[PDB]
Amino acid sequence: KQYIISEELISEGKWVKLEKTTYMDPTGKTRTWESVKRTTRKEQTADGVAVIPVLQRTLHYECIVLVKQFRPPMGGYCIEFPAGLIDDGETPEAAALRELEEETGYKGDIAECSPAVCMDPGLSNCTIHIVTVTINGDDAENARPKPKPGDGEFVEVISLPKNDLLQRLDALVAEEHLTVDARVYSYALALKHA
Amino acid sequence: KQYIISEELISEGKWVKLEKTTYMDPTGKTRTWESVKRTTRKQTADGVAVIPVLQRTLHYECIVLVKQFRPPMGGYCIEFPAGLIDDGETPEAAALRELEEETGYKGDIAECSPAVCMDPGLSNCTIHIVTVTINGDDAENARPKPKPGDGEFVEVISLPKNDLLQRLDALVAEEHLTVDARVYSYALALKHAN
Ligand SMILES: CC(C)C(=O)Nc1nnn(C)n1
Ligand SMILES: CC(C)C(=O)Nc1nnn(C)n1
Ligand SMILES: [Cl-]
Ligand SMILES: [Mg+2]
Ligand SMILES: [Mg+2]
Ligand SMILES: [Mg+2]
Ligand SMILES: [Mg+2]
C-alpha cells in the first residue's frame, strides 16, 4: 500500500543530509516526513556494522566486549558495541572483524551476521549488520590486546560478564555521567529475560 | 577529557535539525562533527520503546511487535511499539499509552531503562526502554483495540519469545521487511543466553 513519491534534498553536509520525503499513505493521501541519511553509503548492504564480541576463556565466564567513547552528537561518553562504517567494497564480516581489532585489539572469529537492520527508522535510513563474533581469549594473539584507534578515534574497552551484564551496565551508569546504547541495553535486558 | 565547545545550526526543519558540532579531542585538538537532533525534546529522553511480553496461559510467551511504513527507510519495518514522550508525560505512562494506541493491549510496567542512545555517532536521540507484561487472559486484552493517532498505520505481529530470532529471519527472508536493531539485539541475546 505505502511508498515513496519523491525525496527532496533540504541540506547536505559532508557526512549527513536532511531530506523532505513525500510518500503515499495507505488511504491514498500524499504526506511528508523529514528524513536523515548519511552521504557515505554507496553499494554497501548497510551503512555500518556493530559487533557483539563474546570473549571466551577457559575457567572464565564469557564476557561481552564494549567500548566507551566521546560521542559529539550526544555531548558525552557512551557505552556501545564496537562499531564502524563499512568501507566501499568491504564485506560486513570483514568490517566487523576489522572494526573489532581496531577498537579493542581483539582478533575475533565470525559466528553470525544479521541482515541489514535499522538504527532509528522514524528518523533515518541508517542500517547496520549486527555481527556476532567470538574471541578466543586463550589464543596468544588476544593476550594483551592493544586498540589501534584511527585518526581522531579514542576508545576505552570495557569487558563485562554476560551473566551479569545488565547489573554491570547499571552499576557503571550509577558511578558517572554516561549513556548506554539502546542495542547494548536491549541485549542485556534479553539476557536477563531469558 | 573531551567536551563540546560550540554548536552551529546548519538546517532546522519542523521535526529534525542538523548541527555542526565543535569539540575538543583528547589530545587538545579541536575537531568538528555533523550531529542530528530532534526539535521536539522538552523530558528524560525523546521517546519510549516498549518490550511487550504477551503472557497467555497454555501458549508460548510472545513478544508483541509492530510493522509500519517508515518514510526514511522507504519501506516497511518491524519494531518494538514506540513513540515520542508527550510534554509532561512520564516514560512509564508514555509506554502504556503507546502500547495501547499501537497494539490495543493494556499492560503493566515490569521495568524501565535509563535514557539510552539510539545512534550516538549520528544523533542525540534517546529513549527509555520499558519492559511491559501483558495479561493476555484478561478481558480487556481479549479483542485488543489499536487506537492509532493521525497518520500512524500499524500492523501488529506477535512472535514467540523462545524462537524470536528465527521468526524474524523468516519474515525478512519471506516478506522483504527491515527488522529494527534493538529488536534484533534482544532476539540475539535470547539465543545467546546461558
Ligand atoms: C508522527 C509524529 C509524532 C512525527 O514524529 N513526525 C515526523 N515527521 N518527520 N519526522 C522526522 N518525524
Ligand atoms: C569518524 C568518521 C568515519 C565519521 O563518521 N565522521 C562523522 N562526522 N560526522 N558524522 C555524522 N560522522
Ligand atoms: Cl519479562
Ligand atoms: Mg566506531
Ligand atoms: Mg572505528
Ligand atoms: Mg510509534
Ligand atoms: Mg501511537
CA of B162: how far to CAs of A168, A188, B131, B185, in Å?
Answer: 25, 16, 17, 14
Dist. CA B131–CA B113, nearest whole Å: 8
* Alpha-carbon distance A144 to nearest alpha carbon in chain B (angstroms): 23
Lookup: cell for B160? 514467540
* Closest of B48, B81, B64, B58 to residue B134, by C-alpha: B64
Q: Name the β-bridge partners of B128.
A: B48
Q: Closest partner residue to A74 among B34, B117, B185, by Cβ?
A: B117
Q: B103 — phi, psi (to 5°)?
A: -120, -25
Lookup: cell for A151? 585518526
Amino acid at B119: D
Q: Tally Cβ neighbours within 10 Å of residue A155.
A: 19
Lookup: cell for A26? 495507505
Lookup: cell for B14? 519542523
Q: Tally Cβ neighbours within 10 Å of residue A124.
A: 26
Residues listed for chain B: 194
Dist. CA A138–CA B194, nearest whole Å: 20
Residue with cell 527472508: B173
Question: Is residue A170 within a helix (H) or strand (E), and if so which, with residue range?
Answer: helix A165-175
What DSSP state is assigned to residue A187?
H
CA Rg value for chain B: 19
Q: What is the dihedral of CA B145, B146, B148, B154, to 10 degrees?
A: -160
Question: Is residue B24 within a helix (H) or strand (E), and if so which, with residue range?
Answer: strand B16-24
Amino acid at B42: K
Residue A9 in contact with partner chain B when CB distance is under 8 A: no
Report the alpha-carbon angle B190-B192-B194, nearest 5.
95
Residue B131 in contact with partner chain A when CB distance is under 8 A: yes
Could you tell me the resolution of this structure in angstroms?
Answer: 2.0
**Do A22 and A54 form a contact (C-beta atoms < 8 A)?**
no
* Closest of A112, A64, A114 to residue B184, by C-alpha: A114
**Do B54 and B159 form a contact (C-beta atoms < 8 A)?**
no
Domain ranges, residue A107:
1-194
Dist. CA A107–CA A143, nearest whole Å: 10
A88, burial (CB in 10 Å: exposed 0-12, middle 13-18, buried 19+): exposed
**Residues B177, B111, A188, A44: is their CA dihedral positive or negative?**
positive
Q: Closest partner residue to B188 among A52, A120, A121, by Cβ?
A: A52
Chain A contacts in chain B segment 134-163 (CB below 8 A): 151, 153, 161
Question: Is residue B189 within a helix (H) or strand (E), and if so which, with residue range?
Answer: helix B181-192
Dist. CA B139–CA B136, nearest whole Å: 8
Q: How far is CA B79 from the centre of its chain?
A: 7
Dist. CA B177–CA A117, nearest whole Å: 9
Q: Which stretches within B24-134 are classed as H helix?
A: 91-103
3-state secondary structure B100-114: HHHHCCCCEEEEECC
CA of B106: how far to CAs of B82, B87, B141, in Å?
Answer: 14, 22, 7
Q: How far is CA A182 from the centre of its chain?
A: 10
B63: CATH? 3.90.79.10
* Closest of A185, A90, A104 to residue A145, by C-alpha: A104
**Do A80 and B120 form a contact (C-beta atoms < 8 A)?**
yes
- For A160, how many CA atoms within 13 A lie in the half-sphere containing its CB? 25
Residue A100, SS3 per DSSP: helix
Asked if B189's CB is within 8 angstroms of A186's CB, the reply is yes
B193, burial (CB in 10 Å: exposed 0-12, middle 13-18, buried 19+): middle
Dist. CA B39–CA B41, nearest whole Å: 6
Dist. CA B63–CA B52, nearest whole Å: 6
Report the alpha-carbon angle B57-B59-B60, nearest 5.
120
Amino acid at A182: A
Question: Is residue A192 within a helix (H) or strand (E), and if so which, with residue range?
Answer: helix A182-193
Residue A188, SS3 per DSSP: helix
Question: Is residue A171 within a helix (H) or strand (E), and if so which, with residue range?
Answer: helix A165-175
Residue A164, SS3 per DSSP: helix
Contact residues for A65 (Cβ-Cβ < 8 A; gap 6+): A53, A54, A55, A82, A100, A104, A106, A135, A157, A158, A159
* Closest of B163, B162, B145 to residue B154, by C-alpha: B145
Dist. CA A163–CA B194, nearest whole Å: 7
Q: Name the β-bridge partners of B70.
A: B75
Residues of A in contact with B69 (CB under 8 A): 1-3, 23, 26
Residue B28 in contact with partner chain A when CB distance is under 8 A: no
Would you put residue A75 in left (φ > 0), alpha (ψ -120 to 50) or beta?
Answer: left
**Distance, first Cα to last Cα, chain B:** 37
B80, burial (CB in 10 Å: exposed 0-12, middle 13-18, buried 19+): buried
Q: Tally Cβ neighbours within 10 Å of residue B101.
A: 17
Dist. CA B167–CA B170, nearest whole Å: 5
Of all residues in chain A, the one with the smallest CA distance to B24 is: A72
Experimentally determined by = X-ray
**Do B167 and B183 form a contact (C-beta atoms < 8 A)?**
no
Dist. CA B128–CA A146, nearest whole Å: 34
Q: Name the β-bridge partners of A56.
A: A136
Residues listed for chain A: 194
**Residues A165, A184, A56, A111: is their CA dihedral positive or negative?**
positive
- For B27, how many CA atoms within 13 A lie in the half-sphere containing its CB? 7
Q: How far is CA B192 from the centre of its chain?
A: 22
Residue with cell 528465527: B166
- For B83, how many CA atoms within 13 A lie in the half-sphere containing its CB? 25
Contact residues for B158 (Cβ-Cβ < 8 A; gap 6+): B54, B62, B63, B64, B65
Amino acid at A173: V
> Total structural domains in chain A?
1
